[PDB]
Amino acid sequence: VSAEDKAAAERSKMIDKNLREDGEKAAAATHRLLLLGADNSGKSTIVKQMRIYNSGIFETKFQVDKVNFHMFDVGAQRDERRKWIQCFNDVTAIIFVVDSSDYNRLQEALNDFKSIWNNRWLRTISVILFLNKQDLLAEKVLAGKSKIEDYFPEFARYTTPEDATPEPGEDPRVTRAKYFIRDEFLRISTASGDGRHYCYPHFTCSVDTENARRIFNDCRDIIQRMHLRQYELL
Amino acid sequence: SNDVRASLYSLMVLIILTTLVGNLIVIVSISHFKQLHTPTNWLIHSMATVDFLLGCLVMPYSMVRSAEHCWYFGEVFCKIHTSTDIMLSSASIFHLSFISIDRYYAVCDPLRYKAKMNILVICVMIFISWSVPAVFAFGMIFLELNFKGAEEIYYKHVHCRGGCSVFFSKISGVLTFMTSFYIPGSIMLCVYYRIYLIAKEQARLISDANQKLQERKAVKTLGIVMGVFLICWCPFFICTVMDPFLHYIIPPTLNDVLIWFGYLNSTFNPMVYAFFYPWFRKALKMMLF
Amino acid sequence: TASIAQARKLVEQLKMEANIDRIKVSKAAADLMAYCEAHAKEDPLLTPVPASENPFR
Amino acid sequence: QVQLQESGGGLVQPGGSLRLSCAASGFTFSNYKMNWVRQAPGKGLEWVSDISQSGASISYTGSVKGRFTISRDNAKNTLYLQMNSLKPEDTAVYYCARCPAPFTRDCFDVTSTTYAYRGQGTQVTVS
Amino acid sequence: ELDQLRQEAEQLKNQIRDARKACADATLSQITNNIDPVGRIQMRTRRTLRGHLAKIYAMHWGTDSRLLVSASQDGKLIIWDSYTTNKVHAIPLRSSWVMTCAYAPSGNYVACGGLDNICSIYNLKTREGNVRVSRELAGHTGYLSCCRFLDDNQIVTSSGDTTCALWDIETGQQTTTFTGHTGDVMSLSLAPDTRLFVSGACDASAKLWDVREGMCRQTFTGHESDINAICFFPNGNAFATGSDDATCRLFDLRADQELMTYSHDNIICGITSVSFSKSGRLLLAGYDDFNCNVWDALKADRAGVLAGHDNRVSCLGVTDDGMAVATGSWDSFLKIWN
Ligand SMILES: CN[C@@H](C)Cc1ccccc1
């Protein structure tokens, strides 16, 4: 009514217009990812690879097929994560990088993944699993000095999957070891998945350039399955 | 046959009541809850509005025409009623087609879906589905070019039909078949076939992944969605487009059952598109308490 | 050295806390009750004010 | 006040057996998962075993399967770790870790450096 | 030696336990059993403030009881005029992951922070009329969980690095640092006089801090899990803590002991936020089941429920005049109840 009330309403309308502009760009047209990994992991190399496309949290922005991705990596945070990891309950996917060549810490990585998977607030978030350090894993397997079955006795009985596609120059032992690790993660993935979220394993290296495309395709698949489930098509 | 026609009146009254009520629940639920305020739900809300207006503005007079076998409301109101009939039927079909297109973009363009299928484009879709049918129907009916070249046949059919009917010529029949039914129906069928293939592939992949270690929902859902539409509309439109070439052999009561299948489509649309999905039911229960 | 220093600081804090002058629970409950009784007539949420006087009509 | 007290330990010959026990108080013992973690000299904390609220589901680390077996007694509010076939690499301080929240299936920070709901720890040495 | 020091700590803990046991001559429940209950409390959603794109993580009331600042994890602070629902400001944050916000008692500034470990101060009354980042307080080695203004120049913040800190906004330096918590400090509450404040942290412990001396005066325990929320009683002689074990508890500073426990067998979800009404008779608590239980603070009876939020209730505040209650939620809507 009055001049002051009209001015307040006009300011509110301008604020709403700016909010409408913001709700499209950087709010709904961009996909947010959480990047997780241990100290020995190579998630820094993953960030460096994705870049070509004193405290707090680190953000990486990259584009694939004109789709905007914001990948977040926690910086100066303590080792207790049951509180600040609730902030990421709505990200499209979680990038989980694992040092597959470190047998001694594979169980620690598996427990990390299991806690991430079974969390109440991350109960609907798909995990993109990067089994990093494949070259180092190959060297360690070929050397034979480290007995992988001494950490995981089930490996003495595990047989490589029939559909396991190996590299042209992959030694059979390397394939068996890498697929054993992948299946160790996938057992946790499937033992508690009610179809609300899925895990997408990938074998990666520090020199690999396909990680951005992997993330793009996996986010596409995640959202496609989410929509299919929403419309009772899945 | 007083008793039989009274039973028919009761049956058509029941159909109108279910259509009106179900569409009213859909409209109120979508418009009330801010939880459901999303562009796809607004497409569904517009479709429900079209169905409700078909229920209240069109069906009862066609019931009178069917039960009394004649028109009591005069030439002017018959023209208005035919125009509204055609407009609202085509608007409902267009809404179905646009919902299909939205679903196609949701499933086959997951990453850019939220940016593409925004409120502006959905409003454009609603405007098209409300306007193109209106212009087409009213222009055809009031300018009388639907029966151009068939004046005597049109009048003979009108007299036989009980006072007035939905009459088309060969060219007008083909044109209305291509506009109201064939194009939206083909778009819907193609997009839903693609969605079916994608859903089957994804289901097979998930099943294989879960089988390597340690329901056919798409078939059921898409079968319901496409079968309701086909059963309701395909017979009427096919027979109507074939009729002028057959030289108008369709006798009364057959057009009646067919157009009442068409109305049954509007009766069922809320069930197929709103009540079928658990989220809408959850919102409705939230309304209950 | 870190553990023993932590223990020393913890025992110092525990002494500081043990030096507190505590009050009987009955008096604390009585004081809380007295505050609630005194300020009951000024709590719009306890006793809804008429729609004519609340701003969120 | 939440407190967990482990008991048992000391020297033992290789191939020997131990029965580690933890007495828990200050919380509803039956509402939480319970874990066993250990820290060998010069190494970080390592998760050893786990057991659900009712004891229905249990887990072990690879190097422990077939040797240790975790047990839970909700009536007595006591957690046990029967340690058989001990080996020199088992020489470590054993802590009992409480799940941070009740009724939850995840155990996020049980193995962290300064987790609040861990026990004081008991030292186990194998000759 | 370490063993001797820990044995001394055990002896001192026994001393404190016995001393506070001697003071438990009665219980608040049996003292208040003789007063009639407040009754079946009813509150209706007067306003529903929408406009946030993502989950709301915190909100705070201005001292005038009209303006309202809320923080959302879409990277936006919005100042609402609760009377008219109009927006007053929309501050774009440099970091999307805001976990807390504050409103200066004078209303000139607002503060916020989160996973960036930085408390940013925004000048709401810039001469040019555009909100500017007045200061960016850095130094905490963990996410900011809470922050509260003492005045236009001093602010107290709690962080996930287990420490609270008192800052001078003008200079931007940590005037005082509060240490002693074993886990993340999750909530904070200044006393009415701002001479004292209490912080609830993981390790299921609450501590009372004196801002001038900069030391812990009392440590309160009794919760079985993390303390997610804490609020001072209007009198300032007591406070209430909400925990992850689905329980609220009331502590008295002078009794140095827990007085009452607010729990029900059918409630098993954790508590995210607590607040008192103006008289302190009603204790409002938010839960992970997106309900809010209105507790009779003196009787421990559920006086009512606030329902209507679609997703987790994250924040909850009562106006200075006690006229209304604002609750935010992970569904991105704020609701004013009365
Ligand atoms: C009964 N109302 C439709 C059955 C008539 C019609 C004809 C052509 C196009 C659309 C609609």
Side-chain angles (χ1 to χ4, degrees), chain E residues 1-135 137-167 169-338:
Chain E
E1 277 82 326
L2 180 62
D3 62 352
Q4 181 275 318
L5 290 166
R6 297 201 298 203
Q7 291 153 14
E8 190 185 5
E10 178 62 20
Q11 181 268 293
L12 279 186
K13 279 185 181 186
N14 278 272
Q15 172 174 356
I16 287 160
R17 186 185 298 66
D18 302 342
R20 65 168 55 118
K21 240 143 56 183
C23 304
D25 69 334
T27 72
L28 177 59
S29 61
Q30 77 185 349
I31 293 286
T32 59
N33 68 346
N34 61 356
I35 53 151
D36 43 315
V38 309
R40 161 254 160 210
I41 298 291
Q42 178 67 19
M43 302 183 155
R44 256 193 272 131
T45 305
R46 308 306 175 163
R47 310 268 184 274
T48 299
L49 319 169
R50 57 186 71 85
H52 280 301
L53 303 166
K55 52 175 179 288
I56 291 149
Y57 235 83
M59 59 79 58
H60 202 217
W61 277 102
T63 46
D64 60 8
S65 309
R66 273 192 77 149
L67 300 184
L68 188 160
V69 66
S70 65
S72 149
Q73 294 222 328
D74 60 50
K76 199 75 77 178
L77 281 170
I78 298 177
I79 310 287
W80 310 82
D81 179 25
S82 58
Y83 286 11
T84 72
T85 278
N86 287 339
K87 319 260 209 300
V88 192
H89 302 270
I91 315 185
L93 306 180
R94 291 169 178 172
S95 168
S96 191
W97 307 107
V98 62
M99 295 178 74
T100 180
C101 69
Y103 219 133
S106 74
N108 298 319
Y109 316 77
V110 293
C112 80
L115 266 156
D116 42 274
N117 303 2
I118 291 152
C119 203
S120 315
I121 317 287
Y122 299 89
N123 199 338
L124 291 186
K125 313 237 188 91
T126 318
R127 57 182 290 273
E128 55 241 33
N130 207 32
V131 293
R132 144 209 182 71
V133 196
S134 148
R135 200 73 64 182
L137 308 160
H140 266 152
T141 51
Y143 66 91
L144 279 177
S145 59
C146 205
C147 68
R148 289 291 177 256
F149 283 93
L150 272 75
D151 61 66
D152 282 4
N153 195 49
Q154 296 175 103
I155 189 173
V156 166
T157 68
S158 68
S159 174
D161 68 346
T162 77
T163 73
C164 313
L166 175 71
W167 307 77
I169 304 163
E170 182 196 293
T171 54
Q173 259 47 48
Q174 290 203 60
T175 301
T176 309
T177 304
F178 306 91
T179 65
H181 274 302
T182 291
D184 314 315
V185 186
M186 280 308 305
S187 210
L188 191 123
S189 189
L190 301 178
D193 42 294
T194 63
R195 296 282 334 253
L196 264 43
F197 75 95
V198 295
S199 71
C202 306
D203 196 15
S205 179
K207 285 178 179 277
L208 179 74
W209 309 94
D210 173 39
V211 317
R212 277 90 184 305
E213 223 68 44
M215 32 84 57
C216 181
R217 288 197 173 284
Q218 311 184 227
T219 304
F220 303 88
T221 61
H223 277 290
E224 296 168 3
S225 193
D226 312 342
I227 301 181
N228 297 320
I230 194 161
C231 193
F232 253 105
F233 198 80
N235 177 184
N237 292 319
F239 64 90
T241 36
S243 158
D244 228 345
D245 60 356
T247 303
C248 285
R249 272 163 226 244
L250 186 139
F251 297 86
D252 191 310
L253 273 54
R254 321 188 274 162
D256 193 56
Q257 168 195 351
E258 184 204 314
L259 294 171
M260 191 144 330
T261 306
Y262 311 93
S263 59
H264 213 303
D265 263 321
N266 38 8
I267 302 160
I268 60 159
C269 35
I271 307 194
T272 63
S273 46
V274 307
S275 208
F276 276 100
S277 74
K278 188 162 181 66
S279 63
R281 182 60 184 274
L282 300 183
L283 168 62
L284 295 89
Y287 291 75
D288 293 331
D289 66 34
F290 27 88
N291 291 4
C292 315
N293 280 272
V294 182
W295 294 93
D296 192 334
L298 296 183
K299 305 270 285 193
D301 295 333
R302 297 171 70 201
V305 160
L306 316 180
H309 278 297
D310 154 26
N311 203 341
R312 184 187 201 184
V313 163
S314 52
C315 48
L316 181 146
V318 177
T319 68
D320 277 78
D321 57 321
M323 197 63 67
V325 188
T327 69
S329 147
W330 278 19
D331 57 29
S332 92
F333 305 120
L334 292 103
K335 300 194 165 198
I336 312 298
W337 312 76
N338 203 342

Side-chain angles (χ1 to χ4, degrees), chain B residues 85-86 89-90 166 168 176 180 233 236-237 259 263:
Chain B
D85 236 348
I86 294 169
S89 302
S90 301
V166 176
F168 305 107
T176 206
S180 303
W233 274 130
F236 166 77
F237 273 99
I259 65 104
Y263 297 164

